[model samples]
Target chain A: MVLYFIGLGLYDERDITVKGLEIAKKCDYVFAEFYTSLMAGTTLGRIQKLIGKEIRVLSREDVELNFENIVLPLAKENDVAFLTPGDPLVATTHAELRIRAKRAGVESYVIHAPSIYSAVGITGLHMYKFGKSATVAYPEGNWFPTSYYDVIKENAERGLHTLLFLDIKAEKRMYMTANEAMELLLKVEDMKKGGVFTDDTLVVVLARAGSLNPTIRAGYVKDLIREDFGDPPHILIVPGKLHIVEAEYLVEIAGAPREILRVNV
Target chain B: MVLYFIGLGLYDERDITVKGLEIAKKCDYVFAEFYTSLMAGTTLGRIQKLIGKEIRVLSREDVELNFENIVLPLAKENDVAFLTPGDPLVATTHAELRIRAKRAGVESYVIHAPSIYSAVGITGLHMYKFGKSATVAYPEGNWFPTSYYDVIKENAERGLHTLLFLDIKAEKRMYMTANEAMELLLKVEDMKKGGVFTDDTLVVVLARAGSLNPTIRAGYVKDLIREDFGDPPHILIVPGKLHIVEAEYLVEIAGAPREILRVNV
Candidate 1:
C-alpha cells in the first residue's frame, strides 16, 4: 500500500517519464490536481488516455484540506497515484503533503519530472546564474503583494538573474502572461521607485517551454512589454548581467538586439 | 534527418521520459555520454536492454573534439539521438554543442528529463530560495579553487541558498562524496578566513537524488562530515535563512537537529 506522487512534466502527456507512466498504470486509483499549474500542451483526456486510467480531478481545496481524508485513505489498502503538473514537491504546500501522508502511515514516493525551474535553460541564459525566484500575483481586495519586486532588486544587486513566475487562477481559467507580470512590476516600481524593473531593463520571456518552437524572446521592457510570446504559461527572467556567450545566444537565438551583447555584457 | 539530445534523467533507464524513449528507439543510431554525470542506479547494459539499441558510449574527448565529424555526419543521413545524464543543455558545455550542431546544418531537438537541479526540491528547502550554483572542484598540487566559497558567501549575504555541485572526474571515475566536499570547504575556510564555512555551519546532503530511497541528511558540518550518505553523486546545499516550514521539513524529513528548528527558523 503506497501513495505515488507523479509529475506530468512541463507540457503534454508524453512528457511523463517511462517510470512515472508505468507506475501510474499499475495504480489501483489515480487522482490529479492541476490548480498549481497547467499543462498547456495537453488536456485531461489525453493524459487519461495515455495513462490508461480514469483520473479523478480534485480541486485546490480537495488537495490542500482533504488530501489525507480522500487520497491517503485510498492508499491504506490500494495503490493510489496522485499526479501534478511539473515536479510533485516543487509546490511549497505540496511538499507538506508528503509529511501528511507519513503522519497517516501511508508511504509516499515522488516520481520526478521536468520542471520550469530547469526548463528555463532553453532560454539560453545560464541556469546557475538565476537567483531566488518569486511569483507575481494579482493584487486583490487592496492586498497588493510587491515582495516580488524586492526579490528582483536583491538579486540584481548581486549580478544574478531573477526568475519570476507569473500568477495563475486555474479555477477561473486565467493565467498571467509575461506582459501582465511586467505591467504589475512597473506599477509597483512607480509606487516604490526602487529603480527595479524599469522600461529600459533587459528581460527574457519563455513561453510554451516544452514545445519544439516555443517562443524565446529577449529585449528591453519598452520593446517587449506588448510583444506576443505566442501563448499562455509565460515565465519572465530579469538578467542582471550577461556573459558574452549568453548575450550572443540571446541575440542569435532569441532575437535580442545586437547592442545587448555589448550593453548588458 | 534530425538529431535529438535526450536526457537520461537522474538515476536509471526507466527515468527517461516517454517522449524521449519513443524518439530514441526510432533513431537510426544512438550515442550516449556519461562524463557529465553518471546514472548511478543503472548500468550501460540495462540502458541498452531497455532502449533495445546498441549504444555507442562516447568519451568527453570523443564528443567535444569529434562531434561535428562523427555524430553530425550520421545525423545528416539518418535520425540520430545523443543521450546524456540529466537535462542535456543544463550541463555548462552541452549548450555549446547545440551551436556545433547548427554549424553542421543538423536540426536538433532537446527532450528534457528530471535533473538534480530541480530534484533538489526533495530536500524540503524552498527551491526558489536558491541562488547562483557552483561546483566544488578537487584541489590539485598547488592549485586550490575556492570560488565556490565566495558563491556561498554572496548568496548568504542576500539570504539566498547556494547549491554546490560536488566534483566528479567522470573520466577518472572519481566522484567526490559530500564528506570530501565538506573537508575541502573546511580547509578553504581556514585559508580564506572568510568565516563563511565552519564546522558548525549547517549543510544539507543529497545523494542518489533520483532513486526512490535517496539519502537526505541535514546537520552541522561537524556531525555530518563523517556521516555516511550511502553512495556517490551527492550534492550539498548551504541554506541561508530558513523559513519556519523549511525548518520543520528539515526536522521531519532530513533529520536535522531540533535546535535548528528555533535557531535557523
Candidate 2:
C-alpha cells in the first residue's frame, strides 16, 4: 500500500513529467487539489484526458483538515496518488502530509515536476542571487499584510533578488494581479516611509510560465503598474544591483527600460 | 529558425515533460551538454531513443566558447533543441546563450522541467526559508575556495536555510560525495574558524532526487559523514532553526535523530 505525491507542473496538463504521468496512470485512486496554484493553460477536462483518470479534485480544507480521513484510508489497501500544482511540498503545509502518511502506516513518495520557483530562471536572473521569498496576500478588512514589503527590503539590502508569489483564491476564482501587488507594496511604502518599493523600483513580471509564449516584462513600477501582463497566475520579482549581463538580458529579452543598463547597477 | 532550450529532469529519461518530449521529437537537430550537471539515472542512448533523434553531446568548452559557432549556425536554418540536465537558464551561462541567439537572429524559448533547486522541497524543509545557494567545490592545488562556507554563515545569521550543491567533473566522472563535502567544510572551519560547520552541525543529504526511491537522510555531521547515500548527484542542505513540523518530518520521514525534535529548535 503506497501513496504518491505527484506534481502537475505549471501552466498545463502536458507540463507533468512523463514519469509522473506514467505512474499516475497505474494508480488505483487519483486525487488532486488546485487551490495551492492554478494551471492556467489547461482545464480539468484536458488534464483528465492526458492522465486517463477521473481525478477527484479537493479543496484546501479537504486536504489540510481531513487528509487522513479522506485520502489515507484508500492508500492502506490500494495504490493512491495525491496531485498538486507545481512540485509537492514546495508549498508550506504539504510536507506534513508525508508525516500523516507515515503515522497512518502508508508509504509515501514524491514525484518532482517543474515549479515556478525554478521557472523564474527564465527571467534571465541568476538563481543563486535570489534570497528569501515571500507571497503577496490580499489584504482583507483590518488584516493588511506588509511583511512581503520587508522581505524585499532585506533581500535588496544584501544585493540579492526577491521572488514574490502572488496570492490566489481558487474557490472565489480570485487571482492577484501584479498590478494589485505593486499597488499594495506602494501603499506599504507610503506608510512605512521605506525606500523598499517606489515609483523608481525595478520589478519583473513573469506570467504563465511553462508556456512557450509566456509574457516577460521588466521596468520601473511607475511605467509597469498598469502594463498588461496577460491572464491569471503571475509571479513578480524585484532584483537588486544587477550585473551588466543581467541588465542586458532584461533589456533585450524581458523588454526592460534601456535606462536600467546604467541606473540599476 | 527557432531554438528551444529543454531540461531533462533530475533523474531519468522519463523525467522530461510531455510537452518537452513532443516538441523535441519535432526538432530537426538536438544537442545537449552534461558538464553543468549529470543525469545519473539515464543514459545517452535511452534519451536519444525516447526523443527519436540523434543527440550530439557537447563538452563544457564547446557550449561556453563555441555555442554560437556550432549550435547557432544549425538553429538558423532548422528548429533546434538544446537539452540540459535540469531547468535551462538555471545554470549561470545558459541565459547568456539566449543573448547569443538574439544576436545571431534566431528566436529562442525555454521549456521548463524539474530542477534540484525546487526538488529539494522533498526534504520536507520549507522552500521559502532557503536563502542564497552555493556550490561546494573541490580544492585544486593551492587555489582553495571557501566562499560557500560564508554563504552558510550569511544565511544562518538571518535564520535562513542554505542549499549547497556538491561538485561534479562530468568528463572525469568525478562526483564529490556528501562525506567529502563535509570534510572540506570541516577543514574550512579549522582555517577560517567561522564556526559555520562542525561535527555537530545538522545537515540533510538528498541524493538522486526525482527518482522513485531517492535517499533522504538528516542528522549531525559526526553521524552521517560516512553513511552511504546510494549514488552520485547528491545535494546537501544546512538548515537553520527548524519548525516543529519540519523537525517532525525530518525525524519521521528522513530518519533523523529523534533528539532533533528538542535540540534543533
Candidate 3:
C-alpha cells in the first residue's frame, strides 16, 4: 500500500512519463489537483480515458487542509496516486504532503514528469544562466505583491536571467497573462524606480509551453506588453545581459528584433 | 516530414514518457547521443528493446558537426527522431541543432522529459531557491577550469543554492564522481581562496536520479568525501543558507546531521 505522486508533464495528457503513467494506472484510486498550474493542452476526460481510471479531482483546500483525512487514509490500505500538473513538487506544496504521508505511516514515492522549470529550456536561453525564480501573483484588496519585482532586480544585478511564473487560479478560472505581469512590474517600477523593468526592458514571453507552435516572443516591454501571445498560462522572462548565441536564437527562432543581438548582447 | 527531439528521461529505458516513446517508435530513423549526460540505470540494448526501434548512437562530433548531414536529410522525406538523456536540450547544445533543422527545411518539435535540473527537487531543497548552475570539469595539463567555483561563490553570496553538474567523458567511459568533484572544488578553493568550498561545507550528493532507491546523502564534505553513493552520474549541491523547512528535509529525508537544523537553518 503506497501513495504515488505523479506529475502530468507540461502541456497534455500524453506528456506523463511511461514510468509515472504505469504506476498511476496500477493505483486503486487516482486523485489530482490543477490549481497550481493548468494543463492548457488537454482535459480531465482525456487523461482519465488514457489512464483507464476515474480520477477524483481535488481542490486546493481539499488537498492542503485535509489530505491526510482524504487521500492518505486510502493509501494506508490501497495503492493511491495523487497527480498534479508538471513535476509534482516544483511549484506545489506537494513535497510537504510527502512529509505528511511519512508521519501518517503511509509510504509515498514521487514519479516526476516534465516541469516548466526545465521546459523553459525551450526559450533558447542557457539553462545555467537562470537565477532564483519568482511568481507574479494577482493583487487583491490592498495585498499587492511586488516582491517578485525585487527578485527580478536582484537576478538582474547578478546578470542572471529571471524566470517569472504567472499567477493561475484554476478554481476561479483565472490565468495571469504576461500582459498582466508587465503591468504589475510597471506599477512596482513606479514605486521603486530602479528601472529594472522599463518599457525598453527586453523580455521574453512564452505561451502554451510544451505545445507545438506555442508562441515564443522576445522584445522590449513597449512592444510586447499588450501583444497577443495567444493563450493563458504564459511565462515571462527578464533576461540579464544576453550572450551572442542567446541573442541569435531569440532573433532567429523567437522573432526578436535584430538590435537585441547588439544591444542586449 | 517532421523531426522530433525526444528526451529519454533521466535514468532508464522506462523513464521515457509514453508520448516520447510512441513518437520515437513511429519515426523512420531513431538517433541518440549520450555525450551530454549518461543514464546509469540501463543499457542501450534495453532502451532499444523498450522502444522497439534500432537506435543509431551518435557521438558529440557527429552531432555538433554533421547532424544535418545524418539526420536532417532523412527528416526531409520521413519522420525522424533524435533522442538524448534528460530533457532533450537541457544540458546539451541541441538547441542550435533545431536551428540547423529549420535552415534545412525540416520542422522540429521537442518532447519534454524529466531532467536532473528538476529532479534535484527530490533532494528536498526548494527548486525556486536554486540560482545559476555550473559544471565541474576534469582538468587537463595546465588547463584547469575554475569558473564553476566562481559560480558557487556568486550564488552563495546571494544566499542561493548552487547545483553542480559533474563532468562526463562518454567516449572514454568516464563519469566524474562527487568525490572527484569535491577534490576539484577543494583545489579551486586553495587557488581562489574565496572560502566558497571547504571540508566543513555542507554538501548534498545525488547519484543515479530517476531510479527508485536512488542515493541521496547530505553532510559536511569532510564526512561525505569518501562515502559510497553507489554509482556514477552524481550531482553536488552546495547550499548557501537554508530555510527551516529545507533544513528539516535535509535532516529527515536526506539523512543530514541534526546540527544543520540549528546551524544552517
Candidate 4:
C-alpha cells in the first residue's frame, strides 16, 4: 500500500496541489493533522465535504503520541494519505512521521503547496540574498528576545532578506500583529539608538497573504506600527539590501517614500 | 483614467487573485506582457478569452520604453490595467513603469495574482531560508553565472533554502531542465567539494509549479540527475540544515530515501 503526503497550500481547500487532490480522490482513507498549522479559513468539515471523502482528523497528540504504532500499521495495509498545511516538511512533526513510514516499508510522495516563505516572492526581494531565517515573539514589557535581531542585522550586513513569522497562539487566538512586530523591531533599535531595525530600513508587511484580502505595504518601522493592515496571519519583511526596482516598487506601489528607502537601492 | 496592475498568479485564469480578476472585469483596457512569462500552457488569446476581455497584448519593449508617454496618459483618461506574466515586480522593468505612473499622478492600484514563489511554500522550506533568487539559463556548455553557487553556499552554511527559478525562455521553445541544472551544479562542485551543491545534499525539484501539472520530488543530487522531471516552468531547491522530521518527510513524502540521505540527517 502506498502512503501519500500532501501539502494543502495556504488559505483554502482549493489551494491543494493537483497531485494532492488526485491522491485524496484515490486514497482509501485520509488523515489530516492541524495542530501545528496555518490552514486556509476552510474548516475541516468543509474540506472533507469538498473532497467528497471521509477523512480521519488526527490531533497533534494522535500523530505525535500514537501514529508510529497505530497509524503506520494502518497505512501499511491500505492506500493512505497524511495531509498537512502548507508544504509537508516545514513542520518537524510531519518530518518524523516520514521516517517511521520508511522503516515500515511504505512508499511515500509529497504534494507541494504554498507556505509563508512562498508568499515572500511578492516582496520582490532577491530570493537568494537571504540568510538564517528567524522568528520573533511577544516580549514581556521592555524585555524582548534580541537573538532574532542579531540574525537580521547580520543578514543586512551581507545584504540579505529577513522574513519574520509572527508568533500565533491559536488556542488563545493571540497573534503578534505585523504592526506590533514592526514596532517591536523599532523599539529595539530606538532603545539601542544606533543599531538594526532602524526607522530607515525598508520593511514590507504582508497581512492575510494568499487570501482574498492580501495587503502589501512598505513603510518605515514606526509608520507601519500605525498602518491599517487588516487582521491576522501577518508576515514582516526586513530587506538587507534592495534592488533599484525593488526600492522603486516599494515607494511607488507599496507606499514607501523615497527618502525613507536607501538611495543606493 | 485609473491604471491597474494585475498579476495572474501561477497558472491560467483562476490563479488570478479574486481581486485581480474583479479589476480585470471592470477595466476599460487590459493588456498582458507574456515575453517575460506565459502560464498554464496557454496562449494570450486563450487567457484573454477566459477572462472575457480583449487584452491589448504588450511586447516587453512597448511597455518598458514607451509606457509612460503612450499608456499612462491614456490610462489617465480611462480605466487601464497592465497585466504581467508572473508577479509584476519580479521583473525590474515593470517596477520602473509603476514609478512613471506615480510621477504622472495617474492614480493606480495593483491586483496581485498567483505566481511561482507561492508554490515554493509547497516545499516546506521556510521562506526566510531562501537567499537571492537566480535563474538557470539553457545549458550554454561552460558559462552561465557563478552567482547562484555563491548564494547556494551561503544558504547552505546557515541551513537555509536556495530557490532557483528556471528561465522561461521555454515559451520560445528554449528551456533549462532540472536535471541539466544539477549537472551544472555538480561540475561547479567538482572542485569545491565541501561547498554548496554537494552530492549528498537533498535537492527538491519542482516543475510547472503553478501550472495544472506541478511536480515535486526530492533525492540525492545523483538520483535527481538520473530522473526526468517534466516540462517547462520548473524550480530547484537545495535545503540547508534538516531537522530529523524534515528528513523523514523528505524521505517518505519528498522522494528522498533513508539509504541515500546521511544517517545523521
Candidate 5:
C-alpha cells in the first residue's frame, strides 16, 4: 500500500501532466486539501469529472487533526492520495506528513506539478542563487516577521535573489496579497532602514504568477503598495543585488520601471 | 506586446498550462530556449505539431550570444516567448537575458511549473531546513569541487538539508547520474572528513522527479553506487542531521535499508 502526495499545478484540471493524471486515475482515494492555495476554475469535483474519477475533499482540520484517524489508517490498508492545489510539499506541514508516513511503514511518493518556484524564473532571476527562503507568517505577539526583510537583505548582501511565499490559510482561502506584503516590508524600512530593506529597495510583486494574466512589476516597496495585486496566491521577490544582465532581465521581463532604481543604480 | 517565458513542465507538450498553450497558439513567433533544462518528450517538432503552430528554436549559442540580436529587438516589436523546459530563468544565463531585455523595455511574464526545488521535499526532507544549494560541476582541473563538501558540512552543522542538483548539458542530452554524483562526494570524503561527507553519510538519490516513476533511495554513497536509479534528470542530496521524525520517515517511507543507519551500532 502506498500514499502519494500529488501536487496539482496552477490553474484548473488540465494543468496536471499525463504522469500525474495516471496516478490520480489509479488512486483508491483522492482527497484534496486547499488550505494553502486554490485553483481558480478548478475544483475537486470538476477535476474528478474531467478525469472521470471520484475524489473526496478534506478541510484543513481534516488534514491537520483527523489525518492520523483518516488518511493514515486508509493508507495503511490501501492506496491513498493527498492532493494539494499546487505542489504538495510547498507547505512545511506536508513535509512533516511525508516523514510521518515513512515512519509508519507506509510507502508514499510525491507526484509534483508546477507552482511559484518554477514560475518565479519568468522574472529572469537565476533560481540557483536564491538563499534560504522565509515567509510572512501572520506575525504574532509583537513578533512582526521582519525576517522576510532579512531574507531579502541577506540575498541582496550576497547579490542573490529572495523568493517570499506570502502567508495563506487555505481553509478560509485567505491568502496574502503582494501589495499587502509590500506594505509590510515598507514598514520594515520605516522601523529600520540602515540594515534592513530600505524604502528604496526594489521589490517585484508576482501577482497571479501562473495564470494567463500573471503580473510582475518591479518598483520600490513604497510605490508597489499603491498598485493593486488583486486576488489570492501571490508571491514576492526582493532581489539582493542584481548583475547588470539580471537587472536588464528583470526590467524587460517584469515591467520594472526605471524610476525604482535608488541604491545600485 | 510581451515576451513570455513559458515553462513546459517536465513532460510532453500537452503538459504546458492552458495559458501557455493559448499564448503559443496566437503569438507571432515562439522562440524556445532549451539550454538550461530539456523536456525529453517535448521536442521542437512535437511542440509545433501539438500546438498547431510553428516555433523557432533557440540554440544554446543563439540564446547566450545572439540574445540581443534576436530576442531583444523582436520582443520590442512583437509578443514573443522565451521558454524553458523546467523553469525558464533558473540558470544564471537566462536571468541575465531577462535583465538585458528589460533595459530594452520588453514586457514579459512567467508560466510557472514544477522543478527540483519541490522534488527535494518528495523525499520527505524539510525544504526550509535546506541550506545553500550547490552543484557538482563537471570535474574540472585537478582542483575539482571539494568545496561542495564544505557547503554540505555547513548545512549538516545546522541540521539543515543539502540539495545537490546534478550538472547536465541538456542539448547534448548528457546527464550526470546520481551514482556518479555520489562518487564525487565519496572522493571529497576521503580528502577531508571534517569538511566532506562520510562514506556513511545519509544521502538521497532522486531520479526522474515529476515523472511517472520517480526513484527515491537513501544510503551511503559507496553502497548507493551499486544501486541503479532508472533515468536522468536525476539529483543527489547529502542530507544533514535529521529530526527523529525525519529519520524514521526515510526508513519507513523510502525503505531505506537496515545497514544504512547513520552511526556505528
Candidate 6:
C-alpha cells in the first residue's frame, strides 16, 4: 500500500534513526542499493539483523530503469521499503522514482538520515558558506574531467567553500582517496592553470564520518597529499576565505596548521 | 571523562539515531538546549521517557556563556551527553564548544543526525545547486537586516539556489512563518529595488521536514503568500534556473505548477 525511502545514515547500521528502523521492521519487504555510497562501518548482514528482516539488494539498473517494474508492484499490495546510503535523493537521481511510484498508483514517503553533506560541519567549516558542490571523477582514456576545478574557481571567487565528492565504483570495490582527488586536481591545475588547487592551497579531509573517531585533518595540500586518513569513504573540502573562529576551530579541532589562525582579513 | 554531542534528529524523539539513543542511555548525565530549533512533533517527557533519563533543558545564555560551569564540570568525572536539534554543529555556533571542551580537558565525540540543512534535498532541487544559505531575521528597533535578500540576488546571478532559514524566538514562542518570510523579502525588494524577490518570483516552502507527511509546496510568491503551510520551523528556497528533471519532480511530488516543466534550458 505504501513505499518507504529510508536512509541508512553515514557510517554504520546503527546510524539509522529509531524512526527509520522501527518503520523498516514492520515493512513487508526491504530493498536497498549500495552503489551510490558504501557504509564502511557495518555489513549488510548487520543491517538485516538490526531491522529483523531479510533485505534484498538492488543494482543501479534495477533501481533507475525498473523501479516501477521491480519495486512498485509489491508496494501496491504490501508495505515496501527502499533504503539508500545518506539522506535519500540528496546527490542521486532517485527523486524521479517518487514520480514513477505516483504514476504506478503507489504512495511513497522519505525518512531522513545523516548525510556527508551535513556531517561535513564536523570539519569546523560553516555550513552556510558552502557553495555549489561537484564530484571528482576517475578520468579514463581521452576522457579527462576537470569541471570540478572550475567549480572550485567559481566558489572561491565568491569567497565560498567548495565540497568535492570523490568518485566511487562500488561494483569494482574502487574508492577514490582524498590523495587521488588532490593529485587529479593538481593535474587539472597544471593544464588549466586556474590556480584553484595547488600545493599551497589549504584543504580539509573527512573520512568515516558518523564514526566515534573519524579522521578530520586540515593542512596545505603539500603536507597532506600523502598523509594517511585511515580508510575508504573520504571527502575533500576546499575552503575559501575563512572567519577567525572557523580558522581557530580548524587549528584546534581538525589539526589545521596554526598559521591558518591568522586570517587574511 | 568524556562529553558527547548528540543530535536529536528533526521532528521527534524517534528521529534520534540508534547510536545516539544507545549512547545517550548509557551517559551519566543528559542535557539539551532547544532555543536554536524546536521539535514540533514530540515533547520533553516523551524524549526523557525514551532515553530513560531525566533531561535538563538549558537556556541560550547558560549555554553560550556558562557551558564550562554547567556542562563540562560534570563531564570531567562522568560521561555526559549534550543533545541538540538537527545535526549537532550545522547552522549553529556550537562547534566552538568542542574547543571549550578540549581546553577544559574533556574529550568530545559527535553523533550525527538528520539536519534541515541536508533535509532540503527532499524539495526536488539538486542539492549541489544550492549556494550560500542565510537566515531571514526579524527587524528589531531601528535595526533592519536585508542581507538575506542580497544572498538570493548573488546566488540567482550565478544560477544557484538559495536556502532561507526563517527566524525563531523560542523564548517568546514566536516563529517566522513562510508567509512572513515572503512578506519580508517583498519589503526588502521594495526598499532595495533589487528585483530579487517579488510577487511573480517562484519559491518553495518546506515545513516539518523528517515527519511522515511534511508540507512541501512550490509556487509563485503571489499565490502562496496567503496560503497555510502548517506549523513552525519553515524553510524557504528561491530557485534560480531549474533542471527539467528537477521541475518535473517539483510538479509531480510537491504540487508545483505544471508550467514549470518548461525550463529555460
Per-model TM-score, in order, reads: 0.97, 0.99, 0.97, 0.75, 0.82, 0.99
lDDT of 5 by residue, A1-265 (tens): 8998887777767666545776777878877777777677566777887556777778878878787677878888788888787778877677778656765778777777777766676666666666667787676697776766766665566566778888977656677788777778767777876456656677787776567676777877667777877766778888776666656655656677754333355
**1 versus 5: better lDDT goes to:** 1
- lDDT score, residue A94, model 5? 79
Tens-place lDDT per residue, model 6, B71-174, is 99999999999999999998558999999999999999999999988899999999999999999999999999999999999999999999999998999999
lDDT of 2 by residue, A1-265 (tens): 9999999999899999999999999999999998887888999999999989999999889999999999999999999999998999998999999999989999999999999989999999999999999999988999998999998999999999999999988777789999999999999999999899999999999999998999999999999999989997889999999989899999999999899999997
Model 2: runs farther than 4 Å from truth? Answer: B263-265
Worst 10 residues of 6 chain A by lDDT: A256-265
Tens-digit lDDT string for candidate 4 (A1-265): 8777776656777656444676678888788877555654678887788667887877767888888766678787788888877666566345566667778888666555556655565565554455667787888785778677877877888787787778766556677788778777777776666588776666889877656446878877766778788876788888876777677667766777777456664
Off by over 4 Å in 3: A263-265
What tens-digit string does per-residue lDDT give for candidate 3 at B1-265? 7999999998898889888999998999999998887778899999999989899999988999899999999999999999999997775478888889889999999998999888889888988889999989999998988999999998889899999998888777788899999999999899989889998899999988888677889999999998998888799999989988888777777889998988887
Runs of candidate 6 with Cα error greater than 4 angstroms are A263-265
* Local lDDT at B88 for model 1: 80
* lDDT tens digits by residue: candidate 1, B1-265: 7999999998889999998999999999999999988888999999999999999999989989999988999999999999999988888778777777787888888889999889999999898899989999999999999999999999988787899999988877788999999999999999999989999899999998888888889999999999899988899999998998888888888899998987777
lDDT of 5 by residue, B71-187 (tens): 778777788876677655666676666566666787656666677775567777767666667888777878576666777776676565778888888778898888778777777
**lDDT tens digits by residue: candidate 4, B80-191:** 8888765556564565666687788887655544455545654545454565566765546675565677777876776666788765563375667788788878877876
Candidate 2 DockQ score? 0.91
- Per-model lDDT: 0.90, 0.93, 0.89, 0.69, 0.71, 0.93
Q: What CAPRI class is candidate 5?
A: acceptable
Error of 2 at B259 (Å): 1.5
In terms of lDDT, model 4 sits at 0.69
Report residue B59 deviation for candidate 3 (angstroms).
1.5
- How much is B168 displaced in model 1, in angstroms? 0.3
Clash count per candidate = 0, 0, 0, 21, 12, 0
Assign candidate 4 its CAPRI class.
acceptable
Error of 6 at B107 (Å): 0.5
